[PDB]
Design a protein around this ligand. Structure first.
Ligand code: HEM
Ligand SMILES: O=C(CCCCn1ccnc1)N[C@@H](Cc1ccccc1)C(=O)O
Length: 455
């Protein structure tokens, strides 16, 4: 039985002030560098254990021993995502019911139906960049978020956010971002009922009311029109859980839509932003990915089958997820008493955090070159040890949107590589901005058209 280490404490605040920082995930990664594969993290009324080694995480991913926990962050997000799929406990009736209903909407097979709508938005991105003047540049995360937001809006419920027509965010997005910020900022308030925060609470409720009212009207409008657009909303309005025989109710449908829009916003655009960052920093890798794009994407717009054939582009995306997974942690609890790694006894109910970026830097798995960007690591999934690579979570609670995100990202990155040469014209210094997701803040490039038509 080993005692686990613990980072520095602040008296009765315990470790909580360590997360009173602009970049808490990177702070936790530095703590893991100092303390090793496991450390205890205490706050007032809270104890968790951060895991960073594949040795321990492979045990944490044993679904017979550990189930998904709502982290404090997810408990705060649940105030506006409700019992949608990502903020539900596994034992809540609406988790399994929504899971069974929505799985066919998110499969590779469903991607064939979404493909034309994804192409629609990808073409708008390419056309924007074709239309820039000589020495203008691209604001990468900003344009990637325009693309991913528009793609989930259109595939999700046939709604055009028209992000490439505007600078100012959509009213839904304004309230979503401000609610997420309040949820993230609240992971520090010792006296949340202090009259000091009444304005934060008032604003938080107005933002929740904005999201609910707007989504509820999208649902009511679709029901009033009878239109059967083949999108996630139609699937939720018509689908029935094979187990209970029941459909989702309108309240839970709204929670799912809010959940999908958040997932498809900066969490997914972050992947594209980091991938393009690593490509311009590794010109030989960019060259190889651009050679694949040219060879495969032989038609004016890509087909579904062509996207599946962008194997090296897919490897680029997985290697970007290895280094900077954009949903950087998930939480587990012990279903029963158990011992972790032969060394750390856990009681039923004890909580674990999986620190994904640090897992993905385990040199016993990847070798000494863990910081290098080498997509070839992903040539063969059977050569990767179990539970070494977890950017989409674990088990039945893994990301339902994984195929959607990777199809979207592979399509757009392929088209980017086909149509432009890229310049890191500022020699950009990576600065990772943290919300509940991760983003290369201020990442800019110049894109020179190869003058290949879309017609
Ligand atoms: C690269 C992009 C994405 C990444 C890295 C990602 C990552 C993750 C991770 C790590 C989890 C597990 C969370 C936990 O255990 O607490 C998760 C769950 C989930 N994600 Fe994603 N996600 C991505 C894109 C998406 C998209 C595009 C959608 C939907 C449009 C989506 C919808 C969901 C849902 C509904 C869940 C909860 C699944 C369940 O518990 O049944 N995600 N995602
Ligand atoms: O350490 C994370 C990382 C957040 C990851 C969120 N996220 C969302 C999607 N992907 C990842 N959270 C913890 C933070 C914490 C720990 C102890 C005490 C108070 C607060 C938590 O929330 O309790």
């Amino acid at each position: 039985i080993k005692e686990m280490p613990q980072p520095k404490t602040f008296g009765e605040l315990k470790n909580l002030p360590l997360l009173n920082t602009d970049k808490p995930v990177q702070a936790l990664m530095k703590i893991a560098d100092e303390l090793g594969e496991i450390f205890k993290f205490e706050a007032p009324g809270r104890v968790t254990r951060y895991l960073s080694s594949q040795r321990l995480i492979k045990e944490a991913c044993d679904e017979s021993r550990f189930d998904k926990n709502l982290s404090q962050a997810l408990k705060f997000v649940r105030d506006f995502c409700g019992d949608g799929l990502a903020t539900s406990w596994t034992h809540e009736k609406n988790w399994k019911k929504a899971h069974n209903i929505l799985l066919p909407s998110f499969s590779q097979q469903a991607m064939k139906g979404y493909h034309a709508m994804m192409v629609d938005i990808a073409v708008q991105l390419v056309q924007k960049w074709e239309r820039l003047n000589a020495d203008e540049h691209i604001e990468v995360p900003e344009d990637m978020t325009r693309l991913t937001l528009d793609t989930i809006g259109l595939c999700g419920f046939n709604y055009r956010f028209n992000s490439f027509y505007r600078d100012q965010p959509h009213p839904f997005i304004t309230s979503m971002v401000r609610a997420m910020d309040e949820a993230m900022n609240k992971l520090q308030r010792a006296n949340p009922d202090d009259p000091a925060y009444d304005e934060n609470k008032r604003q938080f409720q107005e933002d929740i009311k904005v999201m609910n009212d707007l989504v509820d009207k999208i649902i009511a409008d679709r029901k009033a029109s009878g239109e059967q657009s083949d999108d996630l909303l139609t699937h939720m309005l018509n689908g029935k859980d094979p187990e209970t025989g029941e459909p989702l109710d309108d309240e839970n449908i709204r929670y799912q839509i809010i959940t999908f829009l958040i997932a498809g916003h900066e969490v997914t655009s972050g992947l594209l932003s980091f991938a393009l960052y690593f490509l311009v920093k590794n010109p030989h890798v960019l060259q190889k990915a651009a050679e694949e794009a040219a060879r495969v994407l032989v038609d004016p717009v890509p087909s579904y089958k062509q996207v599946k054939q962008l194997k090296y582009v897919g490897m680029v995306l997985n290697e970007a997820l290895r280094l900077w997974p954009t949903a950087p942690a998930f939480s587990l609890y012990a279903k029963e008493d158990t011992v972790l790694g032969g060394e750390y006894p856990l009681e039923k109910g004890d909580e674990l955090m999986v620190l994904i970026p640090q897992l993905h830097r385990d040199k016993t798995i990847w070798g000494d070159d863990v910081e290098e960007f080498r997509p070839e690591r992903f040539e063969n999934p059977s050569a990767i040890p179990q539970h070494a690579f977890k950017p989409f979570g674990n088990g039945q609670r893994a990301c339902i949107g994984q195929q959607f995100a990777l199809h979207e990202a592979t399509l757009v990155l392929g088209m980017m590589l086909k149509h432009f040469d890229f310049e890191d014209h500022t020699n950009y210094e990576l600065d990772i901005k943290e919300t509940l997701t991760l983003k290369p803040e201020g990442f800019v490039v110049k894109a020179k058209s190869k003058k290949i038509p879309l017609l």
